């Protein structure tokens, strides 16, 4: 664990104290006859690193709705805000991901910062349900089924498999 | 930040959740539509690493007197006990460092785990005060003083400097 220099109030001695670990702050500096004492950051506050400071940092303001916390305000971390799952950040706030319609599928997964990116199902694949998550699905392989295609698929529906 | 797998109670889905940072524990696991929620370790408890666990570890028992804390019980660390400054650990407890008598000096600084190690002052050095900390001190250089030695030093006293 690292150290820091401190000027001792009563004697003017410059001491080398031990740092306090992340999550605590120095509640009493060392002196020439005693170790520094660390205390844990009070609720509302944090320190991210081993430090020599006498108060913990205040955590940021609560997340503005509909945003939620992906990290809490805890001893070691400020809160960290995010658009909840299924939404992404645009400018001010959060907006629901695009829903890829039937006949389209996700090409790029939506994130907390970017929207879903849809593409038309390519030939041989289909998507039969609106979804901001699912990808185009390959047709059932009628060949390796011992069957043949009774009815072709579309970008929206699987091909239908059978015989005669 | 790392992840862990969790079996979702209601659906049996095996999800990949985000870990909770050191100092917190997982107070709600992720599900397919919501992020895991971390809470900070309650007073008395700790976690040292980013983790997926549902309770923090209990801190060890208070330090047995005359031992004191060199780390507190805080969110990120169990308490850690030490013999206070000026004492070192031997077996059961703490014992005061050796005091090097006049005519001796510290050869090796005492620690929380080992005692001071004294040596007789070597020629040209002296120590005039009992101390578990101070080293033998070189005589005042009467030459580079423009003076001469009126009275030789001993292992206990400086040489005395003057003229005629």
Domain count, chain B: 2
Q: Whole domain around residue A97: which residue ranges?
A: 84-164
Are B64 and B10 in a shared domain? Answer: yes
Residue among A18, A23, A84 minimizing CB distance to B76: A23
Q: What is the CATH number of the domain that holds B102?
A: 2.10.50.10
CB-CB: which of B22, B74, B86 is closest to A40? B74
Domain end (from B27, B62, B83): B83
Same domain (yes/no): B98, B162? yes
Q: A27: buried, middle or exposed (CB in 10 Å: 19+, 13-18, 0-12)?
A: middle
- Residue A72 shares a structural domain with residue A106: no
* Pairwise CA distance, residues B97 & B86, whole Å: 6
**B38 vs A41, A74, A85: nearest CB:** A74
Domain identity same for A74 and A88:
no
Is the distance from CB of A34 to CB of B66 less than 8 angstroms?
A: no
Those residues whose C-beta lies under 8 Å from the C-beta of residue B87, and which sit 6 or more positions away, are B66, B94, B95, B96, B97, B112
Instruction: List the single residue in A with minimal CA-CA distance to B69.
Output: A37
Instruction: Choose among B8, B34, B37: nearest CA to B21.
Output: B37
Judgement on whether residues B70 and B28 belong to the same structural domain of the protein: yes
* A23 and A99 housed in the same domain: no
A17, A49, A83: which is the final residue of a domain?
A83
Q: In A, what residues contact B, Cβ < 8 A?
A: 18, 21-24, 33-35, 37-41, 43, 68-77, 82, 84-86
Q: Is B154 exposed, middle or buried (0-12, 13-18, 19+ CB in 10 A)?
A: middle
Q: Give the contacts of B135 (CB within 8 A, at least 6 positions apart).
A: B105, B106, B127
Q: Which residue intervals of chain B are DSSP H helices?
A: none
Q: Degrees (nearest 5) of the Cα angle B58, B36, A114?
A: 145
Same-domain pairing of B70 and B147: no
Which residues sit opposite B106 in a β-bridge?
B118
Both A95 and A78 in one domain: the answer is no
Q: CB distance A74–B23 less than 8 Å?
A: yes
Do A2 and A23 belong to one domain?
A: yes
- Specify whether B62 is located in the same domain as B26: yes
Round to whole Å and give the CA distance between A38 and A29.
Answer: 9
Are B141 and B129 contained in the same domain? yes
Dihedral in degrees, nearest 10, Cα atoms B118, B123, B129, B130: 20
Indicate whether A155 and A99 sit together in one domain. yes
Question: Looking at A33, A60, A83, which one is the last position of a domain?
Answer: A83
């Amino acid at each position: 664990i690292g150290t820091y220099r401190h000027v001792d109030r009563a004697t003017g001695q410059v001491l080398t104290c031990d740092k306090c670990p992340a999550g605590t702050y120095v509640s009493e500096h060392c002196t020439n006859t005693s170790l520094r004492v660390c205390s844990s950051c009070p609720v509302g506050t944090f320190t991210r690193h081993e430090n020599g400071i006498e108060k913990c940092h205040d955590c940021s303001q609560p997340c503005p709705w509909p945003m939620i916390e992906k990290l809490p305000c805890a001893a070691l971390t400020d809160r960290e805000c995010t658009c909840p799952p299924g939404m992404f950040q645009s400018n001010a706030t959060c907006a629901p991901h695009t829903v890829c319609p039937v006949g389209w599928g996700v090409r790029k997964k939506g994130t907390e910062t970017e929207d879903v990116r849809c593409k038309q199902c390519a030939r041989g694949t289909f998507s039969d349900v609106p979804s901001s998550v699912m990808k185009c699905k390959a047709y059932t392989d009628c060949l390796s089924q011992n069957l043949v295609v009774i009815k072709p698929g579309t970008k929206e529906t699987d091909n239908v498999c059978g015989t005669l």
